[PDB]
Amino acid sequence: SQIPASEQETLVRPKPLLLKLLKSVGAQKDTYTMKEVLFYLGQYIMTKRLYDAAQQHIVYCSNDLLGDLFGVPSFSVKEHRKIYTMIYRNLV
Ligand SMILES: CC(C)(O)c1cc(F)c2c(c1)C(=O)N(Cc1ccc(Cl)cn1)[C@@]2(OCC1(O)CC1)c1ccc(Cl)cc1
């Protein structure tokens, strides 16, 4: 769609603090597909309520481990490549 399916399928090793984040929402392993990483990040966002009804497409991650990892106070869920780059910054 924005990201190829072959890139979404690929297995990755989170760096230790992304690994902590994913573990906080039930993630049981040391390696994941990008698609699974993004599932748990979706669960983490939705669990911590890092959203606002006024701006329904923006994650509000300031003052959170997520904002520390991603290096931003907020971001758009429409910008997939930018989201992939912020996750690549947190893989071995
Ligand atoms: C409520 C809010 C802020 O509009 C929101 C919140 C939210 F969590 C998501 C999405 C949207 C969304 O579209 N999603 C899928 C997604 C987007 C971009 C990429 Cl590249 C991949 N996956 C997220 O998950 C959906 C879900 O599985 C929890 C149910 C989602 C996942 C991961 C990330 Cl990093 C950012 C966003």
Side-chain angles (χ1 to χ4, degrees):
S1 267
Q2 288 179 52
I3 303 306
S6 67
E7 179 175 357
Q8 294 181 71
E9 284 159 29
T10 297
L11 196 84
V12 288
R13 195 168 285 269
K15 286 180 185 188
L17 297 165
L18 175 57
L19 199 79
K20 148 169 186 67
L21 188 150
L22 302 162
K23 279 170 155 58
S24 82
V25 283
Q28 237 84 53
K29 339 210 295 231
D30 289 291
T31 53
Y32 299 85
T33 75
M34 286 295 317
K35 216 168 215 313
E36 291 172 326
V37 162
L38 277 126
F39 179 93
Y40 290 118
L41 287 163
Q43 296 297 98
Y44 181 88
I45 281 159
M46 293 297 223
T47 289
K48 285 217 161 171
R49 321 154 202 83
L50 300 178
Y51 54 75
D52 193 85
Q55 298 298 323
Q56 295 203 15
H57 284 89
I58 295 177
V59 180
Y60 286 97
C61 52
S62 70
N63 215 354
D64 193 274
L65 172 66
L66 190 50
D68 304 331
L69 301 192
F70 270 23
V72 294
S74 68
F75 60 99
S76 175
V77 313
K78 299 151 144 294
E79 301 267 22
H80 294 177
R81 170 57 62 200
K82 289 176 176 195
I83 295 172
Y84 264 62
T85 303
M86 294 184 296
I87 299 170
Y88 287 129
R89 288 163 182 143
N90 296 279
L91 316 169
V92 173

